[PDB]
Amino acid sequence: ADTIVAVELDTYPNTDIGDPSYPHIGIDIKSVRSKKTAKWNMQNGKVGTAHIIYNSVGKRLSAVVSYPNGDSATVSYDVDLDNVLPEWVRVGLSASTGLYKETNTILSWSFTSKLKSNSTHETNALHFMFNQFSKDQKDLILQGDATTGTEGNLRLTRVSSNGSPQGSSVGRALFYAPVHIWESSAVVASFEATFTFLIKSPDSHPADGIAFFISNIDSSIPSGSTGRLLGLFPDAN
Numbered sequence: 001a002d003t004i005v006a007v008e009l010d011t012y013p014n015t016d017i018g019d020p021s022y023p024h025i026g027i028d029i030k031s032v033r034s035k036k037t038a039k040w041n042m043q044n045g046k047v048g049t050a051h052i053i054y055n056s057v058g059k060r061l062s063a064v065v066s067y068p069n070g071d072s073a074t075v076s077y078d079v080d081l082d083n084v085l086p087e088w089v090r091v092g093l094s095a096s097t098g099l100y101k102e103t104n105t106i107l108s109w110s111f112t113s114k115l116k117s118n119s120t121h122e123t124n125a126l127h128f129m130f131n132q133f134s135k136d137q138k139d140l141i142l143q144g145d146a147t148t149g150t151e152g153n154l155r156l157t158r159v160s161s162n163g164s165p166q167g168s169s170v171g172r173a174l175f176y177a178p179v180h181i182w183e184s185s186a187v188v189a190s191f192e193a194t195f196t197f198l199i200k201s202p203d204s205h206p207a208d209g210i211a212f213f214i215s216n217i218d219s220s221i222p223s224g225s226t227g228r229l230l231g232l233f234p235d236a237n
């Protein structure tokens with residue numbers, strides 16, 4: 001039932017559902033089967049950073065993922081999000097481990113959306129940024145296994161008290177205020193999203209991955225979404 005638009009950092013390739021044979025980054029429009037992908041040289045144990053940009057004039061959603069001292073990976077897709085998403089939506093982070101595991105730690109997360117109307121004032125906006133997470137992080141909706149406060153970070157998937165990641169885990173963090181992406185009077189709508197992450201695993205085959213996503217305000221973790229479904233989708237269709 002949920003309506004999901006997402007940018008995915010897919011660390012475990014599942015070639016039987018359309019994934020490339022290599023870890024990658026991709027744009028998902030209402031399906032795990034990414035409309036576009038790009039090769040991603042994931043670095044186990046290092047902090048990477050993901051950037052996601054869109055505007056209603058260009059009508060293309062793009063994402064760039066990079067690690068310090070490393071060439072970045074870029075993926076883009078032509079898409080009018082007004083035709084897939086509702087007027088009011090919630091944005092968030094999601095992550096999953098399945099048969100294989102990894103830590104899905106968010107060290108920082110910022111977001112900006114602006115609606116620009118034909119009138120002279122011309123600006124409606126929502127912006128937030130987390131560089132320090134708290135135990136009772138009231139302005140975030142945590143779903144599934146997601147917790148906050150551990151080393152002031154957001155953990156989207158379950159991690160043991162000794163630091164070891166756990167498998168068969170899924171978790172998301174939604175910003176608690178709804179976001180206004182469409183408006184009748186608007187002449188241009190746009191948004192940016194940024195987040196820093198630490199994926200770490202004792203396995204040479206980490207799984208499953210981390211995604212940013214924009215969805216209906218009542219979205220919840222679909223049941224059985226542990227694994228490559230990344231907490232976003234109920235199936236691989």
Ligand SMILES: [Ca+2]
Pocket residue numbers: 010011012013014019208228
């Ligand atoms: Ca995958």
Ligand SMILES: [Co+2]
Pocket residue numbers: 008010019024026032034
């Ligand atoms: Co994928």
